């Protein structure tokens, strides 16, 4: 009973009848949006060190060395509890050309490495500014719209709400974020950013981007043990933004770090009803944090029967843990008046480390897969990802395809049996935390 239950009131405006978007006309323009998340840069990464140490994070000087030099940390990363060297990140931005030009970029937190015990505020800012300047160097004019992750501050997950004031607050972090991201965000967005770490703006006509600070929903944010009731009034603020976009007829993309399924109950539950209320206004939801390729389907609140939205959970750039580095690109309905702004398809690129770390190897980022093609989907709409889940329940060969891509082409040695399957398939339907009914049909 540590966390209380609370409610958020929706405006008196009646909900318009549900009208799921219609597919775009033949040959309509399509925009490409890059999605980066969980870069996790370890400035202490050292090739050849022991990648299987006893500490939380290995592949460092303090991690020691292995007796067999063959078993030492690789040049571009390692398949272990290790984060990325600056090389692989800078190499990621270098090879973006083949991933087509981008209209926008979404960047969703987890920038520092997992060296929690020895991390200072100065170290965190050094990561923020270093990798921000690098991303802006390679993308140039293309704007990047970032979001706050759970590793940005110190201690990890410590994001006090606004009512906690003074030096103990996270104003040292939001202030630096406003300075670092000023080239990318307008003034009104920076104003909100400096306060609660979230903001809203219009990247293009008819679209409204909302970047949420999901640390106010995290079970790990120890600060929320004081008061977990809509910290920073973010959910209430979200309702006002969504309702205002409904009035203007705009569409909304929401971005964040922790997907709403991994949130505290009340936050996740209140979030669930806001989605359902503004299903016509929402055009996309993009999160990260999980480091793995996934998605979460939303249903109508009362009966949990009609799927009405999907949140795409892109995979990490980092290897943590035993993963190939990869990134994501979304194909979205283009920039024209009659656009729905929805996700039409998406692609995933990786860097096969076994080939990049091999003697004489070279890092070449390649497309791992394209969703619709490999899952045989007529589109990327909620109903279509709903069918895919219950399809993977019936046959095994298709789930193994999903399970393989899950791990960015590098799944573990132990196979995923029938108890692992239901757990995985059930998570794809659990966009609302602590809701066992959502998996009744599994
Ligand atoms: C936690 O605080 C809420 C109200 O304030 C919250 O924090 C603000 C800084 C801002 O983020 C708001 O959006 C938040 O809601 C308390 O809610 C009160 O609840 C009583 C009855 O329980 C109600 O009569 C009051 O009107 C509420 N206050 C407001 C401002 O609406 C809540 O009680 C606090 N939690 C605990 C355990 O005390
Ligand atoms: C605000 O709080 C932070 C967190 O404790 C302080 O950070 C430390 O500051 C001292 C200098 O007084 C340094 O020696 C430590 O290395 C800092 N630690 C970390 C983790 O950053 C900071 O000093 C405080 N600021 C003020 C003005 O009191
Ligand atoms: C990453 O690269 C490795 C090495 O090229 C791939 O492993 C090889 O896979 C082929 C068939 O796919 C086998 O015949 C070789 O014996 C494998 N070599 C080694 C050293 O294991 C691996 O499939 C690649 N993975 C991805 C996702 O591209
Ligand atoms: Zn992470
Ligand atoms: Zn995270």
Residue numbers in the entry: 167 to 608
Provide text from the study.
Acid sphingomyelinase (ASMase, ASM, SMPD1) is an enzyme found in lysosomes and in the extracellular space where it catalyses the conversion of sphingomyelin, a major component of membranes, into ceramide and phosphocholine. ASMase consists of an N-terminal saposin domain and a C-terminal catalytic domain. To gain insight into the molecular mechanism of ASMase function and the interplay between its domains, we determined crystal structures of the full-length protein from mouse that reveal a conformational flexibility of the saposin domain. In one conformation, the saposin domain adopts a globular closed form independent of the catalytic domain, while in the other conformation, it assumes an open V-shaped fold that establishes an extended interface with the catalytic domain.
We begin by describing ASMasecat, which was also crystallized in isolation. Its core, composed of two six-stranded mixed β-sheets surrounded by eight α-helices, belongs to the calcineurin-like phosphoesterase structural family (Pfam PF00149) and resembles recent structures of the ASMase-like protein, SMPDL3A. Like SMPDL3A, ASMasecat possesses an additional C-terminal subdomain (CTD) consisting of four α-helices that pack up against the core burying 1,795 Å2 of surface area, thus distinguishing it from most other phosphoesterases. In the structure of isolated ASMasecat, a phosphate ion is bound to the active site and forms several interactions with the protein and zinc ions, mimicking the scissile phosphate from sphingomyelin. As in other phosphoesterases the di-metal active site has octahedral coordination geometry from seven highly conserved protein residues, a water molecule and completed by the phosphate group. In addition, His317 and His280 are positioned near the bound phosphate as potential proton donors for the ceramide leaving group. Mutation of these histidines and assessment of enzymatic activity at acidic pH with the generic small molecule phosphodiesterase substrate bis(p-nitrophenyl) phosphate (bNPP) revealed that His280 assisted by nearby Asp249 is the likely proton donor, while His317 is probably important for substrate binding. Unexpectedly, we found that isolated ASMasecat had no activity compared with wild type, and interface mutants also diminished activity on bNPP. The structure of isolated ASMasecat is unchanged relative to the catalytic domain in the open form full-length protein, but analysis of their crystal temperature factors indicated that interface formation reduces catalytic loop dynamics.
